Design a binder for this molecule. Sequence first.
Ligand SMILES: *[C@@H]1O[C@H](CO)[C@@H](O[C@@H]2O[C@H](CO)[C@@H](O[C@@H]3O[C@H](CO)[C@@H](O)[C@H](O)[C@@H]3O)[C@H](O)[C@H]2NC(C)=O)[C@H](O)[C@H]1NC(C)=O
Ligand SMILES: *[C@@H]1O[C@H](CO)[C@@H](O[C@@H]2O[C@H](CO)[C@@H](O)[C@H](O)[C@H]2NC(C)=O)[C@H](O)[C@H]1NC(C)=O
Ligand SMILES: *[C@@H]1O[C@H](CO)[C@@H](O[C@@H]2O[C@H](CO)[C@@H](O)[C@H](O)[C@H]2NC(C)=O)[C@H](O)[C@H]1NC(C)=O
Ligand SMILES: *[C@@H]1O[C@H](CO)[C@@H](O[C@@H]2O[C@H](CO)[C@@H](O)[C@H](O)[C@H]2NC(C)=O)[C@H](O)[C@H]1NC(C)=O
Ligand SMILES: [Cl-]
Length: 627
Amino acid sequence: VTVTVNKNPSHTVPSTLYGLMFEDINHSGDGGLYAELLQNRAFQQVTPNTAAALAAWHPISNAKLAVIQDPSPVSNALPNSLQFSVPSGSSGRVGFTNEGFWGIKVDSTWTYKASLFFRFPTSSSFSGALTVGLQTNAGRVLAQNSTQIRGTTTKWTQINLELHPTASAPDVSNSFFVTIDGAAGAGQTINFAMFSLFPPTFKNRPNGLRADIAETLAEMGPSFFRFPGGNNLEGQTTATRWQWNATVGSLLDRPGRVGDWGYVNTDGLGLLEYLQFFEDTGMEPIMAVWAGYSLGGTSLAENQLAPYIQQAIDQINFVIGDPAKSAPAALRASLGHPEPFTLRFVEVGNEDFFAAGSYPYRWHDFVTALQAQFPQIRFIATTNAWNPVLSPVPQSYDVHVYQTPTWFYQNAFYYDGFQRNGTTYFEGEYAAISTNANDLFGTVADGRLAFPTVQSATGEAAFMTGLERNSDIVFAASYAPLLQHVNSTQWTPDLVSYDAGSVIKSTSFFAQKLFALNKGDQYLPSTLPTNGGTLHWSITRASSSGKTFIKIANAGSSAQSLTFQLTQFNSVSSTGTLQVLTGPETASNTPEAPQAIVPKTSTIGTGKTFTYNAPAFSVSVITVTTN
Ligand SMILES: *[C@@H]1O[C@H](CO)[C@@H](O[C@@H]2O[C@H](CO)[C@@H](O[C@@H]3O[C@H](CO)[C@@H](O)[C@H](O)[C@@H]3O)[C@H](O)[C@H]2NC(C)=O)[C@H](O)[C@H]1NC(C)=O
Ligand SMILES: *[C@@H]1O[C@H](CO)[C@@H](O[C@@H]2O[C@H](CO)[C@@H](O)[C@H](O)[C@H]2NC(C)=O)[C@H](O)[C@H]1NC(C)=O
Ligand SMILES: *[C@@H]1O[C@H](CO)[C@@H](O[C@@H]2O[C@H](CO)[C@@H](O)[C@H](O)[C@H]2NC(C)=O)[C@H](O)[C@H]1NC(C)=O
Ligand SMILES: *[C@@H]1O[C@H](CO)[C@@H](O[C@@H]2O[C@H](CO)[C@@H](O)[C@H](O)[C@H]2NC(C)=O)[C@H](O)[C@H]1NC(C)=O
Ligand SMILES: [Cl-]
């Protein structure tokens, strides 16, 4: 096919076109992007004196463990403590371990920071060393440090110790440990609370993020971060929704919450840590506010909304407000950030097409109040576009789609037929998740993708050429879900996977990165792709440099030739770069073969005319300079 490139741009490409969608799903927060290495660190939201309260914790030797509703808890937010008792007549090493999130990476090039709170609930003559450390799951000690404690310490006391492994472990089957001498400790009871183990963090942020994962997200060159969900915003009930104020301040003051994917969230990855990550990466937030629906099906009545609308105003004030004018903005100042953060976009709820009977009134009351307080923010509606009809008229809608790879190349003209009437669209969740049109959300045996494939990434890329062509009205687009702990999965496929030790960049991650990193501010119209066809392209140009990015998706099983005609330009560089992602149709990056499919960069000859053969199942970017 001959593709004529117009030199005259049709529209400016929004700075926000490509970004990320985050919720704590598949242990993407706890266990994932948040760097904390101990699971169930503070006994949040568990039933005392049950086995589940002790999840991830194990005795060493004859130690007696229980999770208790502490008569004198470490804080209002953390009512539970680990009661540790050493039997009469004990000896040697007695204590307990934490298995981490399916392991702990023990690296001798890393210093770890261990902390806990303890008290003796009954004053005693105990005198001896408390030891913390890391050990292989055989009990082989790799790091250890200790400090002297006394049984006369009946008030809550924090211990802070650094750990330096003598050797890197051969795998991630390691545990954190706390021990005392069994003979010196015989008959003693200690109460513990609020444990923590951190490795070095992204940008050395206190209370920060896991370095490999955060660097992988930054590598993708995102412009926005949609958070905190997603289903994980909503809760199962009003009382279990996400709440911004429970996520800020000391970790002692964060009660956690049962999230929407089977596990407790610490809320250690809270509002200020999200905003700090945006600052560190140059992303802006697309921040959701709870909108009076939870996933057990309860809508708040119209006459119940007021306090929840005020909470949403308080949440935005934390982010942008003048510290002299509100308590939440003074709190941001008090936590070391007096300058407001950037916030231009707020999403009202999540997937309110599930509660379309109530969303008209919830949308109306939330947006009337929030637009009055925040006249510069753009509020995004979550129902299906224009059904039901909302008031006020939404300036933006969030569109989600999970479909087959084939649907994605067949629907690359999704936005071409939309009216241009001042509405902008966020593709806030999309993914090609299955090859089975009959059962998209079924099992891997029934066609669900365990991991993104070449087929699914190339279908996506064809659809993304439409997003870019239609970027006059499409302002933002994110794959979902972003992250996956391969040891605790609730949804596949995911953009980036990991275990406790290493990261797996999917084929779809590479498609996302090739689109995002190779994007100009000018959209250059070109010969249209065949609507329904397997072959798609989108061309942008950087006004400041003339760097021109020709993105090509062949989502089909046939190689296809393209001849580009740049005759309308004055000059075209005599060479260009080619970046290509390709492979067999069903190929994936997996924990066992994490680099099976990776992009290849080369130099090609270019000019006012050149020919490229787009291989079957490929994503290609050709960069040239045009003036
Ligand atoms: C985070 O902030 C929210 C408010 O934006 C706090 O929720 C509010 O908590 C108070 C005190 O528990 C609630 O009032 C209580 O209501 C009950 C039930 O009718 C009544 O029996 C009590 O005397 C009291 O008035 C209030 O309704 C609730 N507001 C909302 C919107 O949920 C929340 O506690 C804060 N979280 C943390 C950890 O501080
Ligand atoms: C045990 O942990 C203590 C506390 O983290 C370590 O001592 C700290 O070492 C750092 C780094 O040199 C200093 O900045 C701190 O001032 C030290 N604090 C104290 C109270 O000494 C100690 O090095 C660790 N020991 C081992 C064997 O890992
Ligand atoms: C932008 O254009 C769309 C498409 O015509 C309008 O959408 C229609 O909205 C009405 C209600 O306002 C619905 O009953 C129609 O079914 C919608 N049409 C389609 C094809 O979805 C939308 O109203 C327009 N928005 C503005 C701000 O003018
Ligand atoms: C976490 O998941 C990894 C990745 O699936 C598991 O490691 C694999 O274990 C399987 C099944 O035993 C082996 O066939 C693979 O060869 C392992 N792959 C790799 C890349 O190591 C691991 O066992 C899981 N961890 C836990 C605690 O369940
Ligand atoms: Cl398909």
